[PDB]
Amino acid sequence: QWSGARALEALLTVAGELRGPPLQLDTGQLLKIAKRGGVTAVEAVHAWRNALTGAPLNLTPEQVVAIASHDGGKQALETVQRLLPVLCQAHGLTPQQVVAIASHDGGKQALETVQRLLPVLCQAHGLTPEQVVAIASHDGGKQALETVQALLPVLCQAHGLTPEQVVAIASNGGGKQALETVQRLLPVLCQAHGLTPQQVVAIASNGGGKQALETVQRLLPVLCQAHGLTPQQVVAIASNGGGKQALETVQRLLPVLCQAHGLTPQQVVAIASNMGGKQALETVQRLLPVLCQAHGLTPQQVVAIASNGGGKQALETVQRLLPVLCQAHGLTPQQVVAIASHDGGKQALETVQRLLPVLCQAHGLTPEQVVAIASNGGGKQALETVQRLLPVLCQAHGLTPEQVVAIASHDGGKQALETVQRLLPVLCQAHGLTPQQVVAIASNGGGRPALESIVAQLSRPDPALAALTNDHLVALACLGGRPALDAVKKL
DNA sequence: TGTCCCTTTATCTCTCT
DNA sequence: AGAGAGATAAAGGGACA
């Protein structure tokens, strides 16, 4: 017999029960826990289903799933029910922060280390609990936390970094490795290659930060005379997420892409300067001619699609969908390029294909409006949120579809929409803002925290803002959102 | 195998002017 | 408004007990 048969039946038996009270988990939630936390995590969730759901902890189903769905998920579940009350009552963390720390591989370790080191990091090293939480909230959080305790002094004193920079480097998966590498390579990269400490911190502050720094050290000379790449270009490739893989792939593919396709080094660097830049470049090499053939898309448009995180996904999705979206849905190919040219272009493209008919027929939007909503980062999220909230926003709150479309049509559109839905009543009824004013605040990137800052100032007034009328606060919030409001308090 | 840690890739949100 | 940046998540490998 296949040995895993017994364990699979075990998994499936306990699985079916969890669909019952008090968690009621779907198949996706169940598969998720099984694939990352394994059967032990599934058995643990069931075993501790009642201890977590309500009294005392009051963890949602979602939160239980978030904790359970990682390597050692069973350990994190045991640790949370034990340490959540300690970290909340004795260190003043919110349950949300405890759950965030918990929801990574080795969550147990992170939680116990936060419990152990938060006092010394805050008192003796001058960090805030929020900074400690951020450091802890990644795989290997325990290692990062111990490494920050160990290295914060030498990094600030011997190497001139600020505590904020140290915290930023630590606040990535593998943070311990990046910190140790920065300690070693900061003088080398700064003195031999003329990089600013800020540039070094930028390269280091990514997952795989150790690899990106070591690859910059190794490849900077070669890249900056053989290829006539500037240091600024190499730093950009190394600091934007693509890191080590992106840098090595730029070395390989720059001449190929320029010579075979007529791209500039700037176009190649742009493609490279994203998460998964390696994947994007290789896909461009493959797919550009296929996309530009038969007088199809231009190289320029192919570059734009490629030049975002998930570029590879965007490119292949366009390849699969350009025909059906243009022909069956009636989009210009220029409209398809527009939707594709953002982080998560693939998600947005697939969501437009799925939801354009529904948004048009059931909600009365134009395809232009669907395209506009789709054409931002997280376009998929904004499109699904418009589908869900258009009727309550229009019918119960009185907004026009035009206003809903405007709110949705920025990065974070989903967040802006949910926050208007949530806060419009108290803003208008309780505080005398007009709906137009609420829509105006919400119709920018950062619409949600801009709205929340306004509500905070109207419900728990900070005297530092008291000289501003509601109208002036509205103008400020529209101009620069939460940050402008915060900046104004500081003076 | 279960748990911990690290790296890559992809997606989403907000800030900075 | 479009670059820059942080946050978050999925998924695979190394390491070890």
Numbering used by the authors: 231 to 721
What do the authors report?
The structural observation suggests that Ile34 may not be a major contributor to the affinity of DNA binding by TALE repeats, consistent with the classification of NI as a “weak” TALE code. It also insinuates that base A may “tolerate” a wide range of amino acids at position 34 of a TALE repeat when there is no steric clash. To test this speculation, we generated dHax3 variants with the 34th residue on repeat 7 substituted with different amino acids. In total, we obtained nine high-quality structures that elucidate the accommodation of base A by Leu, Met, Cys, Pro, Trp, His, Thr, Asn, and Glu at the 34th position. Among these, the hydrophobic residues Leu, Met, Cys, and Pro all adopt conformations that do not clash with base A. As what happens to Ile34, there is no specific coordination found between these hydrophobic residues and base A. Trp, Thr, and His, in spite of the presence of polar groups, do not form H-bond with base A. They also appear to adopt conformations that simply avoid steric clash. These residues may all represent weak code, if they are used for base recognition.
